[PDB]
Design an enzyme around this catalytic site. Structure first.
Site, short mmCIF file in Angstrom:
data_model
loop_
_atom_site.label_atom_id
_atom_site.label_comp_id
_atom_site.label_asym_id
_atom_site.label_seq_id
_atom_site.Cartn_x
_atom_site.Cartn_y
_atom_site.Cartn_z
N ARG A 13 4.54 -83.73 2.06
CA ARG A 13 3.75 -83.42 3.27
C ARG A 13 4.03 -82.00 3.80
NH1 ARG A 13 1.46 -87.84 6.02
NH2 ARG A 13 2.54 -87.30 7.99
N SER A 137 16.25 -65.83 9.97
CA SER A 137 15.57 -66.61 11.05
C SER A 137 15.56 -68.08 10.83
CB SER A 137 14.16 -66.08 11.33
OG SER A 137 13.20 -66.55 10.40
N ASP A 143 6.20 -79.92 18.50
CA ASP A 143 5.05 -80.80 18.62
C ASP A 143 4.21 -80.28 19.77
OD1 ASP A 143 3.29 -82.93 19.30
OD2 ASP A 143 4.68 -84.42 18.47
N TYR A 156 11.24 -90.29 20.65
CA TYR A 156 10.69 -89.21 19.85
C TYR A 156 10.39 -88.01 20.74
CZ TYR A 156 7.33 -86.35 17.44
OH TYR A 156 6.65 -85.26 16.92
N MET A 158 11.58 -87.22 23.70
CA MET A 158 12.84 -86.64 24.17
C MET A 158 13.43 -85.72 23.09
SD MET A 158 14.42 -89.99 26.02
CE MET A 158 16.02 -89.26 26.34
N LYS A 160 11.88 -84.12 20.61
CA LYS A 160 11.08 -82.89 20.45
C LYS A 160 11.25 -81.96 21.66
CE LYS A 160 9.21 -83.28 16.32
NZ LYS A 160 9.85 -82.56 15.18
N1 LIG Z 1 2.08 -84.67 10.85
C1 LIG Z 1 1.68 -84.32 12.11
O1 LIG Z 1 0.56 -84.56 12.56
C2 LIG Z 1 2.65 -83.68 13.06
C3 LIG Z 1 2.30 -83.52 14.43
C4 LIG Z 1 3.23 -82.94 15.30
C5 LIG Z 1 4.47 -82.52 14.81
N2 LIG Z 1 4.77 -82.69 13.49
C6 LIG Z 1 6.10 -82.26 13.04
O2 LIG Z 1 6.03 -81.52 11.82
C7 LIG Z 1 7.13 -81.86 10.95
C8 LIG Z 1 6.57 -82.33 9.60
O3 LIG Z 1 5.67 -83.42 9.85
P1 LIG Z 1 5.40 -84.48 8.65
O4 LIG Z 1 4.30 -85.40 9.15
O5 LIG Z 1 5.35 -83.78 7.31
O6 LIG Z 1 6.78 -85.28 8.70
P2 LIG Z 1 7.06 -86.76 8.05
O7 LIG Z 1 6.35 -86.87 6.72
O8 LIG Z 1 6.85 -87.84 9.06
O9 LIG Z 1 8.64 -86.59 7.86
C9 LIG Z 1 9.17 -85.51 7.10
C10 LIG Z 1 10.41 -85.97 6.34
O10 LIG Z 1 11.44 -86.20 7.28
C11 LIG Z 1 12.49 -86.86 6.61
N3 LIG Z 1 13.30 -87.78 7.42
C12 LIG Z 1 12.92 -88.86 8.20
N4 LIG Z 1 14.03 -89.51 8.63
C13 LIG Z 1 15.12 -88.84 8.13
C14 LIG Z 1 16.58 -89.01 8.19
N5 LIG Z 1 17.13 -90.03 8.90
N6 LIG Z 1 17.35 -88.11 7.53
C15 LIG Z 1 16.82 -87.09 6.82
N7 LIG Z 1 15.47 -86.86 6.69
C16 LIG Z 1 14.62 -87.73 7.31
C17 LIG Z 1 11.81 -87.72 5.49
O11 LIG Z 1 12.41 -87.41 4.18
P3 LIG Z 1 12.40 -88.43 2.90
O12 LIG Z 1 10.93 -88.68 2.68
O13 LIG Z 1 13.14 -87.60 1.88
O14 LIG Z 1 13.21 -89.62 3.40
C18 LIG Z 1 10.33 -87.30 5.61
O15 LIG Z 1 9.65 -87.11 4.35
C19 LIG Z 1 7.93 -82.94 11.69
O16 LIG Z 1 9.03 -82.31 12.36
C20 LIG Z 1 6.94 -83.49 12.70
O17 LIG Z 1 7.58 -84.08 13.87
C21 LIG Z 1 3.89 -83.26 12.61
N1 LIG Z 2 7.52 -86.85 11.82
C1 LIG Z 2 6.31 -86.94 12.44
N2 LIG Z 2 6.04 -86.54 13.68
C2 LIG Z 2 4.78 -86.77 14.12
C3 LIG Z 2 4.27 -86.46 15.32
C4 LIG Z 2 2.96 -86.73 15.68
C5 LIG Z 2 2.13 -87.31 14.73
C6 LIG Z 2 0.82 -87.70 15.04
O1 LIG Z 2 0.24 -88.53 14.34
N3 LIG Z 2 0.42 -87.55 16.30
C7 LIG Z 2 -0.84 -88.18 16.72
C8 LIG Z 2 -0.64 -89.56 16.90
C9 LIG Z 2 0.63 -90.08 17.13
C10 LIG Z 2 0.83 -91.45 17.33
C11 LIG Z 2 -0.24 -92.33 17.30
C12 LIG Z 2 -1.51 -91.81 17.08
C13 LIG Z 2 -1.71 -90.45 16.88
C14 LIG Z 2 -1.29 -87.69 17.95
C15 LIG Z 2 -0.41 -87.05 18.81
C16 LIG Z 2 -0.87 -86.58 20.03
C17 LIG Z 2 -2.20 -86.75 20.40
C18 LIG Z 2 -3.08 -87.39 19.54
C19 LIG Z 2 -2.62 -87.86 18.31
C20 LIG Z 2 2.69 -87.64 13.49
C21 LIG Z 2 3.97 -87.36 13.20
S1 LIG Z 2 4.85 -87.58 11.83
#
Ligand SMILES: NC(=O)c1ccc[n+]([C@@H]2O[C@H](COP(=O)([O-])OP(=O)(O)OC[C@H]3O[C@@H](n4cnc5c(N)ncnc54)[C@H](OP(=O)(O)O)[C@@H]3O)[C@@H](O)[C@H]2O)c1
Ligand SMILES: Nc1nc2ccc(C(=O)NC(c3ccccc3)c3ccccc3)cc2s1
Ligand SMILES: NC(=O)c1ccc[n+]([C@@H]2O[C@H](COP(=O)([O-])OP(=O)(O)OC[C@H]3O[C@@H](n4cnc5c(N)ncnc54)[C@H](OP(=O)(O)O)[C@@H]3O)[C@@H](O)[C@H]2O)c1
Ligand SMILES: NC(=O)c1ccc[n+]([C@@H]2O[C@H](COP(=O)([O-])OP(=O)(O)OC[C@H]3O[C@@H](n4cnc5c(N)ncnc54)[C@H](OP(=O)(O)O)[C@@H]3O)[C@@H](O)[C@H]2O)c1
Ligand SMILES: NC(=O)c1ccc[n+]([C@@H]2O[C@H](COP(=O)([O-])OP(=O)(O)OC[C@H]3O[C@@H](n4cnc5c(N)ncnc54)[C@H](OP(=O)(O)O)[C@@H]3O)[C@@H](O)[C@H]2O)c1
Ligand SMILES: Nc1nc2ccc(C(=O)NC(c3ccccc3)c3ccccc3)cc2s1
Ligand SMILES: Nc1nc2ccc(C(=O)NC(c3ccccc3)c3ccccc3)cc2s1
Lengths: 250, 251, 252, 253
Positions: A13, A137, A143, A156, A158, A160
């Site tokens: 991802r 850096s 988030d 979660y 808290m 972030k």
């Molecule tokens: N996706 C979104 O829409 C979104 C929105 C807002 C913020 N973000 C932020 O962007 C970043 C990347 O998002 P993402 O959706 O790619 O993340 P994700 O797939 O939910 O998680 C990224 C990786 O975090 C690792 N992780 C989870 N628990 C862990 C633990 N206890 N120890 C070590 N590693 C652990 C996992 O590694 P393994 O698979 O190797 O276990 C997982 O593949 C995150 O910080 C997320 O909060 C994402």
């Molecule tokens: N490690 C990860 N962190 C995050 C943080 C946010 C999201 C994401 O899906 N956010 C969505 C959402 C969250 C929960 C339920 C439905 C949708 C989001 C966040 C803010 C507003 C709208 C949607 C997904 C992930 S995965």
């Protein structure tokens, strides 16, 4: 001669896309993972086929505990062992699930996982990165929705919020060492694997710019900018990459 | 074929550096000026020597008045006339001076300059830019990283810069359906006002966590270049501070 | 001579009237500023004067920006000194509110003068006049907007003016602190809905509010103003208190 | 049974004491939580009970994060119901505060447990316990935040992380608890009561930075904002953090 980067949670991802783009930019990469061993090793193989000896994997649980400082020191040490230097740290790994305030995991496990991965591990990784020290850096994955949070995600959120505090405090304290500390804040990017299509579409429709989620590559592009020589006066800044989602009222 | 950019206040300092870097990236540029004709033309000459007929100048006063809307429409129109398109608007022009609350410009002149140049002209330019519209269309507004810790006795200036944050957010929301992104770059201390004494310049430099120095104009421009690029195509409504950590520093 | 005095702009109806009423109930003498609502302004002043004689006056002024706005603002503050011999509190409540779409009978320059004048420039000029007239618990309260970072579609000039009002609140708190004048804000989310709005549309906005699925009463907004002018807020300056029932916390 | 009741954490001294006193003056019965300051907690309870019998009790607990923290926090809320039959107000005031430099006798995991536990985790667990017990009335929680969270003191990263987490909790809990009629707000001091052992010459360096009066807030000035937030005058306010900082956060470097 080539700089080196640690990316946490880099097997899949967004963290995978960050590792790939750093590698394309010329970095040697430590691909940290917790459970996704096959995906991690597969990525390292792909990167090494492109340029030999430019990728290693490093396994660690980033849940908070009394051995988390040692695990975080080991992640940084793995970069020095493989590459002789560590120029960039990307704190991407993250646990994410609801923790309702009103009622298989104990609440102390949920605290350890959600606050550990999103905040404490980044802090300890930052400590270890700084202590072991060009264009140094750190980039924290924040988030964009931290002030308009999802219902029942208090721990979660808290974590972030704590990561924003770490970004600012470490930018302040590490500036005299030439280490910049910044953040990239997605809104909706790659949606959780568990989520149904109808629900994914609900969230996509909320985004002003295109009615779609960010690609992983779009999030990685902002990380690339912040580690680049084009960002050498930027520290303590968090860049939203959210298609305007945080601007949309209820 | 090549995209085209308007940069307001482009003759000198930060706006000049932005115009130079856009040009270096492959844009054709409209160099807007008010009083700095010679400098504007000198820059256009330099750019056109590099690639012929890729830089034009456009005069306009950006003070608020009954004619400001026509002047802003002309700036945008000048880009379409010269280049057949307008892909990027950089609202860089600014007035900056104190306006104490407790006591030769009248207060309403200070309003027209500080609020007009820094907020109303960006608003009118945004309207004209959007009205005249694959592509990668965006607007970048030059904001101020110190907007919440403002300089003493700069209320009107601070009001205008806060209004510009509001425009950035409102226009990002409203123009997103048209594929027009709207973002900001917020310098801390960059090029010090030419009028400012050398000792006061050093006082400010010493407060910056990152190397105890001001931003070059080129560091500001680098953030503008990122925001207009394909590497920022999901970014709208974001303001990137480029301040060396100065806004993080308590009293 | 010894009851304090307050100016409330746009005080004939709605939130401004509630603020004027609550200040009056707390013991203030009040200037009820108004623009078009003469009947409502005079009716309110009559009610307040019946409760305690010689404690309410009206003052008419357009707060649209123009080259005479500084004189009009000076005059509002002067009316308080003329009536009551002092001016302890200034509440900047008057506000124009309507959409100004970026992509297409008032000219754009009229819309700028009204929306930026009422919401920002008139508060600035009133702040100047209020401060310059000073010789106690002096303060200014600006009516802000909790939704300024998640704005209504096509309201850019309104939102610019309210953002500018946040900047004035912070700049004036900093600059007037040496004079003992505190400057704070109260930021409603949805309170009294516009008179022109139909019930169905009102209910759409009510349903968005986490705390009670209802808009703030005018008195609820006035309660926060009363706190900020009171002795219980003597160390508070540069603060904007949201009174929004959680609305600004709710994602799209 | 008609008087409301409040829990105030870290209430033996300084700001928490002034909050407990003002709440009592307003008509609340109070649980005075303390960790190490037993004598001062008991002295306050005795003063309050002399004013009105059976209106104050003490409750000891360490609010450092650990396996037992959830049970401790449940016990604090339970103490209010056992003493007074109700719990209307929770004030999360207790706080550890000391530097944790990123670059180089407590281990770093102890510092995490103390700084993140007191400032963030214990408020979250107390908030859970408070709400679970509630699953005329004016229920609310007030979190003691920090007006300087975005311009932090050098080398206080863990403290600053905990206070940022507390902003998150205030917002997330306001949203989630609003259906239950429980409001959740914050009061954010800039500089209030300084350490008594801090030299006056250092105290004055901080005092001179404050625009409004060039002095720190009294504990009572901070308590006044808490009293407003729990009152009937704030019944539409949730998710708000009121700075009580004399303009300090507006002052550039
Ligand atoms: N996706 C979104 O829409 C979104 C929105 C807002 C913020 N973000 C932020 O962007 C970043 C990347 O998002 P993402 O959706 O790619 O993340 P994700 O797939 O939910 O998680 C990224 C990786 O975090 C690792 N992780 C989870 N628990 C862990 C633990 N206890 N120890 C070590 N590693 C652990 C996992 O590694 P393994 O698979 O190797 O276990 C997982 O593949 C995150 O910080 C997320 O909060 C994402
Ligand atoms: N490690 C990860 N962190 C995050 C943080 C946010 C999201 C994401 O899906 N956010 C969505 C959402 C969250 C929960 C339920 C439905 C949708 C989001 C966040 C803010 C507003 C709208 C949607 C997904 C992930 S995965
Ligand atoms: N320098 C810094 O450290 C700093 C810090 C914070 C924010 N910023 C922001 O960054 C941007 C650029 O900064 P800068 O220092 O390069 O700006 P600047 O030199 O102060 O001014 C930029 C240009 O604005 C134009 N301008 C001023 N008043 C005008 C009017 N009434 N009509 C038309 N044009 C007018 C002038 O053009 P002519 O010369 O042609 O008349 C001037 O050269 C500004 O938006 C500023 O607020 C800068
Ligand atoms: N109502 C809400 O839900 C809400 C939400 C967010 C923020 N607010 C803020 O709270 C404050 C009170 O809101 P409200 O709904 O009570 O306001 P409102 O009824 O919309 O307006 C209040 C008064 O503003 C005066 N006004 C308008 N244009 C003027 C001009 N050109 N010159 C002088 N006065 C002028 C009018 O006076 P006359 O009638 O005498 O002409 C009007 O009665 C405003 O600042 C508003 O922006 C309200
Ligand atoms: N004072 C200021 O200038 C200032 C500035 C900004 C924010 N604040 C915030 O305002 C609140 C009150 O400030 P203050 O100066 O009065 O606080 P303080 O005196 O530093 O601490 C208050 C109490 O917290 C309790 N505490 C500390 N560690 C604990 C633990 N591990 N377990 C349980 N309780 C513990 C202590 O109780 P015992 O004495 O019983 O051990 C202590 O008396 C705090 O949240 C603080 O962060 C204060
Ligand atoms: N002088 C005035 N200022 C304002 C500011 C806001 C509102 C208000 O109605 N806001 C509503 C809303 C605005 C426009 C169209 C529909 C509803 C609002 C604001 C933010 C989020 C949701 C609803 C009403 C007024 S009246
Ligand atoms: N539990 C507690 N939390 C806090 C938070 C802040 C302070 C405080 O005194 N802050 C001062 C300061 C900090 C370190 C050294 C001297 C003074 C302060 C905070 C922000 C900016 C400037 C000064 C004191 C305490 S006690």
């Amino acid at each position: 001669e080539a700089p080196a980067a640690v990316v946490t949670g880099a097997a899949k991802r967004i963290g995978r896309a960050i590792a790939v783009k750093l590698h394309q930019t010329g970095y040697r990469v430590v691909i940290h993972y917790h459970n996704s061993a096959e995906a991690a090793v597969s990525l390292a193989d792909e990167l090494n086929k492109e340029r030999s000896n430019t990728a290693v994997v490093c396994q660690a649980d980033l849940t908070n505990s009394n051995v988390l400082p040692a695990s975080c020191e080991e992640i940084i040490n793995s970069c020095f062992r493989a590459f002789g230097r560590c120029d960039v740290l990307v704190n991407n790994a993250s646990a994410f699930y609801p923790t309702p305030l009103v009622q298989g995991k104990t609440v102390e496990t949920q605290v350890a996982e959600l606050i550990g991965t999103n905040a404490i591990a980044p802090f300890l990784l930052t400590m270890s990165f700084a202590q072991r020290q060009s264009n140094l850096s750190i980039v924290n994955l924040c988030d964009a929705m931290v002030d308009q949070p999802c219902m029942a995600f208090s721990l979660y959120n808290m974590g972030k919020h704590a990561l924003v505090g770490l970004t600012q405090s470490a930018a302040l304290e590490l500036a005299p060492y030439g280490i910049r500390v910044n953040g990239v804040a997605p809104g909706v990017s790659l949606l959780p694997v568990a989520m149904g299509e109808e629900e994914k579409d609900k969230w996509r429709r909320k985004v002003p710019l295109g009615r779609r989620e960010a690609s992983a590559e779009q999030i990685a592009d902002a990380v690339i900018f912040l580690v680049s020589g084009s960002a050498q006066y930027i520290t303590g800044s968090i860049i939203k990459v959210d298609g305007g989602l945080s601007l949309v009222h209820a």
